[PDB]
Amino acid sequence: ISDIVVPDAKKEIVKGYEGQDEKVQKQYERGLITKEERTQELIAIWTKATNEVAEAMNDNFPKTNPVSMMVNSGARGNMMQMRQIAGMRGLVSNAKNETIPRPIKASFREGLSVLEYFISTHGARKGLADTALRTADSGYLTRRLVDVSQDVIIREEDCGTERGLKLPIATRDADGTLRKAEDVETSVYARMLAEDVVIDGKVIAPANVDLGDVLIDALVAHGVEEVKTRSILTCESQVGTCAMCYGRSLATGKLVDIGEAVGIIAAQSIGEPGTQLTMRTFHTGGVAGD
Amino acid sequence: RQAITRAMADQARTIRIPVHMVEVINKLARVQRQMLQDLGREPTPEELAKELDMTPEKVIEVQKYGREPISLHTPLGEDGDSEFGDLIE
Amino acid sequence: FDELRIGLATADDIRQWSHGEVKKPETINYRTLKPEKDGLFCE
Amino acid sequence: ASTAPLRISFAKIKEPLEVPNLLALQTESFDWLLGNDAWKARVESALESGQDVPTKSGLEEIFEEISPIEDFSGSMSLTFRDHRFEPPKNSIDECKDRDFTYAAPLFVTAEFTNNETGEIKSQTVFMGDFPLMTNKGTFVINGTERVVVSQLVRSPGVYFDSSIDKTSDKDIFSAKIIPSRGAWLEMEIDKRDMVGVRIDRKRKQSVTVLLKALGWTTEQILEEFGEYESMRATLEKDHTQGQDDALLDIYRKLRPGEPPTREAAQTLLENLYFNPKRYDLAKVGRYKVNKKLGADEPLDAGVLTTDDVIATIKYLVKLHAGETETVGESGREIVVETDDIDHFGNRRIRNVGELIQNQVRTGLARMERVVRERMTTQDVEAITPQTLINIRPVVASIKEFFGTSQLSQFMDQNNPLSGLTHKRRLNALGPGGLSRERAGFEVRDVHPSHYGRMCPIETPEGPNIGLIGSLASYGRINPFGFIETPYRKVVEGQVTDDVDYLTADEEDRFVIAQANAALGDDMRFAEARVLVRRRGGEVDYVPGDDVDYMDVSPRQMVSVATAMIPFLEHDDANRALMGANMMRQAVPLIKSESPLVGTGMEYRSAADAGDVVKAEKAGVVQEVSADYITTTNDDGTYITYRLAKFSRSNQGTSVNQKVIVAEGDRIIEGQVLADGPATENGEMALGKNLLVAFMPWEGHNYEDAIILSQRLVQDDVLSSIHIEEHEVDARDTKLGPEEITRDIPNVSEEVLADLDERGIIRIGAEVVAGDILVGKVTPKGETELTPEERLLRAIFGEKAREVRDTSLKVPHGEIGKVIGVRVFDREEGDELPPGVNQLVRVYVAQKRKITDGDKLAGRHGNKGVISKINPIEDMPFLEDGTPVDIILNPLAVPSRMNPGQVLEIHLGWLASRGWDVSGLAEEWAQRLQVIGADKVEPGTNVATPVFDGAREDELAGLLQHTIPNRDGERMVLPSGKARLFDGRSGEPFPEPISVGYMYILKLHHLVDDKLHARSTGPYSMITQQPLGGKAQFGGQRFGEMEVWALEAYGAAYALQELLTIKSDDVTGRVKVYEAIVKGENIPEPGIPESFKVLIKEMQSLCLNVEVLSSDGMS
Amino acid sequence: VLEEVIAEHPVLLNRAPTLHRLGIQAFEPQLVEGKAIQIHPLVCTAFNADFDGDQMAVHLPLSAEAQAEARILMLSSNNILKPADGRPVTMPTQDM
Amino acid sequence: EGIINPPIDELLEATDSKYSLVIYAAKRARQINAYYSQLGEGLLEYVGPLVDTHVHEKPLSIALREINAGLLTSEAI
Amino acid sequence: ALKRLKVVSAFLQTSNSPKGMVLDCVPVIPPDLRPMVQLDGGRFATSDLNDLYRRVINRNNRLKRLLDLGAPEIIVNNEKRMLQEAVDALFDNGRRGRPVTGPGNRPLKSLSDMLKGKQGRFRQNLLGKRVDYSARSVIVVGPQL
Amino acid sequence: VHLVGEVQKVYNSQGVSIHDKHIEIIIRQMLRRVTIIESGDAELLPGELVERTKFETENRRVVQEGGHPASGRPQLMGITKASLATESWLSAASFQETTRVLTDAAINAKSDSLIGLKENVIIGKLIPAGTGLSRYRNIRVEPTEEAKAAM
């Protein structure tokens, strides 16, 4: 219990925030402000308070204690879990998706009160029901994707094609420098060039080769801004799709064999993190359809 | 009444029962119900045998023949896919 | 198994598949427990 | 005072009101249904105490509901005046042992009066064997123990809703009047700026036609109802006029195909809604209708009148027009607003009494139809009350309720906590209720009105989340069916000792304080700022003397199972849910010990469950033994309590009952005489307390797995008796009678060595898998001996009988000791089902120790299978050579967000080696001194209530002042961690490791039941694939996603052999088995049988589905 | 004899949800005590298999073709990379 | 001393595909298992284990050993 | 004028005659795919298709008996409509109106109801099947492997 | 580009990474059809779903005969509508709609070539992918001459 440490600043910070909240509430009792405006400013200032106490907790911790040693190492855990274990829990959604103006000021180490525990159970049961229905819908989507994406098999070694897809390789460049794309690993990698690329009269990369870290680094260093890469959308093959237009397989890291069911692999890979997404609209804001 | 009860004997049950056996079994059922509402308890098969003037073995054979088949598609419970027909080899 | 066909089945095809007429609603005998003749379940 | 064992409590605030009887939900409801002595004593005590309570019973109400009926001439009448009960002819142990239903005969005094003859025939008729609820709250039917849980349903009444349509760009309001039994009616206003009625949603219609069809004319409508513009528009746009035209139009629209008729339409409108039999609105329905609509003193029970429909119309149009407050039509000034159906004051529970009452009502309605049909074809002066009524529908309805129903559930007896939870569960499913397909997010979620009435923590985490929920600890049920909760009255800022039980309706109009709020020397609030709650779940504070109710305990929101969890406020809500739902799976061990740290409710949670033997009367023990306890009460009688020793529960666990009383010690009423399963000294004990260290240990505690010492194997710590019953019956088939005989054919003599003379395995004979238990032979089979077997028969010789070996053998992978055999004979007086000649049941009991794969768990949602039972010398050990008993991964707890287990562990250590706090003059020390937890002997149990537990400072300071064990040195540092050695290498671990005592459960996910294997076994019949299940030697299912995975690999051959060879081929399987046995290569796969079955089923839908080869057809 | 036979005869371990391709993997069997399947930690997150409680099914490749595909295509040591994005999947992260 | 004892990268570089390799080894394992079940018939088409074999060994391990050793070839018809 | 034409083309290009639109003979399932199996205690387990087929033969035989002798057109037409409804419930129970129930609890399973849905032949008996040589047990971690 | 980027920004908002080719396979399966208009010369009905390959083959057929080609607009349809509108009626029947597709196949009298993986799982044959291809099952295995000479 000494390994989980509450920040020493948390007490005075929540004391000051309760002082100003009491000032706001005693101002509201005279009717000078509507209840909706008070609720909005209260959730705003309490979001500020929970972000600031998360910062205080992230300043208090040492690099030696086991909990930080297992969240900062990527071993197991997240920073928000330590935020709501060491610092205060934060704003918690009510039933039918709005937020209680009053937050949960108690950490799990200090122990929640009765009503704070009740309003936390409000969100917990919603999360359990949501993840059950989400994994059901993910399974349904996976089934539909598999049945639409089957009979798509690599059936040819190579096409005669040179047509391809023009993908951005370097973007968001600053003044006097070039930066490569942020999501190049899942857009341009594991593909092949439809044709050679030259900038100074000499070839940088050959045609029909897998793209890796060093080749993309050479391309972005030499000064290219877009790459015509061989994709499966532009594949014109008499039977199915070819291995070269698909590119190298990502399961084995080499070129895909003739006969590998790429449609089923694609459908399974799309439908697998459907239960991992864990997304829902936090608040509608009082308006529907926006 | 004659035609309706004849067609009930010959068509209502999936395993068909002859009309004389149908009247035997329903007479046994009605006298058993009468003894149940009189004595206030389930009558023993021996007393039913004496009051029907038949042997007790005939009485238990009649009670055996007076059954109704259960469908193979009856669900067991919460699961709809696991059927009653998939539990028997 | 070159392919698999499907189509409307006329009365001739239904009679061709059939090995006989099911002329009785009876299924099994209640005593001998043997399937009835010229009806359902008929041997 | 001596009812409970010693347990030092860490609570800070006294409890004004003790927790009520936890079994009252079942017993009080069934006592009301029976109307026995307890119910009438309760109603007279409540009447002399002034509390509202029904003076009418459950069966007398339903007998008086059947009014004396009249025929077409109005000649006869029959009246059921008085109902009565006789003692059951079979005792409860007799019913349990001999496969009976615990029931008592039900009589009623029926009199038959004929007006024409002036002749009265009063008689007593036996209405059937009504099943009875025991003092435990269970129904023993067909030898099995069942519980009938309460059912959450919508309360009958009016309901107003508001919605927004994107196309209309405006709000639309609706009203509905849902009754207890009858049909439903709706009123939707301004679908296209017109108001309309739905009569069972049959045909398009308006409101003016229905009002004109009733007794009010157009002038009255335009005079009284003329201040709302939309209804005026509907009135002026109504082309039809007059009562006759409106009635004929509504009859034509409701029932097309026939010409309208005055009498037919009048009878239909009087029967659909106004009929006292087809629209029996309940007492709760009428109460809620007149409460919402403001009807001041209407009829207590009845159908809806035209006045109620008119008031509903006025309420709906007032709500649509905008105003939220109005004078009630025939009533007072009341508020107008929409109400949501998920509010817990609109949710009503049908208890066991109401459910059985509804089933009896259905049976009696069928009986009334039968008696009407009888009297329509019977002559007068030949009718007797013993004759014209038939009790068959009533008994049939009762028996169809108690079996094959979603409400009468097989009671789980894993442990007393599971039994109590099953009693206390409120089930939103079932007949006449919200089904799982009909469930949505809004009805599953926790409502702000659930506080004190339904537990937000524990609920089944499967597909029915939120639908089934456990009742709160302090919850009470209204006579109507609404769930109450007690609050202390607060007057002029002073919390007085007066308790009012408030349901969810009156709770909203008041403001409710919190039990955690501090109080001064007097009963006034010491602090002006108090955290309170009000209508709608708002949590805003209020200063000074403005509150008017207070919580009776911080234990109010939590259920019985959740309250067993110490340091719940530190655990996450998800982990609290998992722990509460998982403590019900804890098996009872050989000998149980109550938790070293745990909430003080465990004694109440064990005593209120009825498996613990408690004294009915106060006296002194005279004789004590393992089988019985004989006590002499002070009045002079001698009462003997029998104990169930090594009997089988419904889940296979033993219900062995230990003894705690001495030879001659005094006994008071309700004092625990003998323990139960999973109890110690009358206190709940679901597991064992073990030494715990959080550390990764060589990867055997990975993904929250379990490493544990062999001391939990050798010292018999985590082990349990499991009793399994298994039966067979010798029947009289067509070929002959099956015989239970020793002379089993085609078997060696040593196999049948342990059988009795009649073919029964002896008591206490150790038995293994495949052994002969009871020797049953089938009389004969169609014999077609092969010439080879005929020649072999000539050499060896065979039995003249040629009987078949169908004896009952032990299932695969089962080891046990036979502890009992029960034989029922037709030739004796024992009753047997038709066809069978005799029946035998054998119980085998095994003392299962703890092994790999056995799932264990704590009380805070932490769980894991066992990966390694280490030797004692391999476990890390403390500074005194004490090895730790279980190693837990510390990686799990910060991600699972349940630090409370760690808290528990520290206090567990503090309860192992006691503390000495006296004169320390510190805040926590003074708190412990005024509480009483300042001088604690080592090993004594401590108590932390579920929201008044021991604080952080108290644990830290007590860890500072733990009593030393040896050499005057204490062993755990004030940080809570101890320097811990290594059992393998021997060098001490670098950093101190946190150690203590966690109370670990043994779940019923035993590895001996999960393991199952098959190479070739039984096959299904409709399709020739293997069947499923562990007991029937079935194969695992290779579903669609598995086949997708194998196609993604691109392994055609493995997929083909898993689909065609290893199932579904009547000839491939045998050939492959021959090829494996003979060592040759596997033959080529054929065609699966299910494809042929598909072709045959498509061919019989008149589709000429024909296979084609390259050359031609097939 | 059982110890002698199960050598060089792969079996397919399979967890029930099997969201992606690596839910079926071939392993070399080895006789152990107890009644629980012993699985490698290093592969568990490929199956998404925690040890709270998780029953795994084992299928037996039967002919030469089936166990050849198990040894060559399905071997757990050949499935380091996840087919969804090419990142390694057989390096779980809790204690190692 | 296991399944992985034939290194698989050598098999791929000696086959140039993975499905060809698995069906190739399966056919050779079938031939070896048919040879073991000849019961002294002396059939010419079935050629025994070309590599050394223990007292008991699966035919598929022998098949992969001969594929890895490079002493066996296959051609498409 | 589009959609109707398509179906007319479906009857014009192919060789299937529209004589399959209305049927004169009703095929039956082979009896082992609609089994009536003995159950312990003297009971029977019967497929619902046996009940549907039995109703079809009952109504057809009654119609034959009505046509043998002199009957009014209303009785004959009523029995013909009953026979048509029996055939329809045999092919689809519950496509029109209230489904045939039987004992009073659940709708009677028909021919097309086992070629449809989660419980149909396509998804529960063809793509996903039970297997032999298979087992299932809980997993524990072994780091020595 | 729009569909790939939209699904990738939905997935990337959480943190899960999926390569673009997995999306592009389904997107190519999505744009496989065409809606045909002014098809008075191609001798089929107008305004219905036509596969791209069949439409293109009919275009070469009608321009080899000398007639003018029909017009066609690319049609983007759901994965369910692309699943049901398939050539093989076994895969259509094993998917969501199970009664309507069988009636439609009976009226159309359509015979399905047994290519594809669902209707090869159903019938029990080898799937035409991976080891089940014709080019992999046609090899013949025999020992080399020097291996025979050694022993």
Ligand SMILES: [Mg+2]
């Ligand atoms: Mg798990």
Ligand SMILES: [Zn+2]
């Ligand atoms: Zn290509």
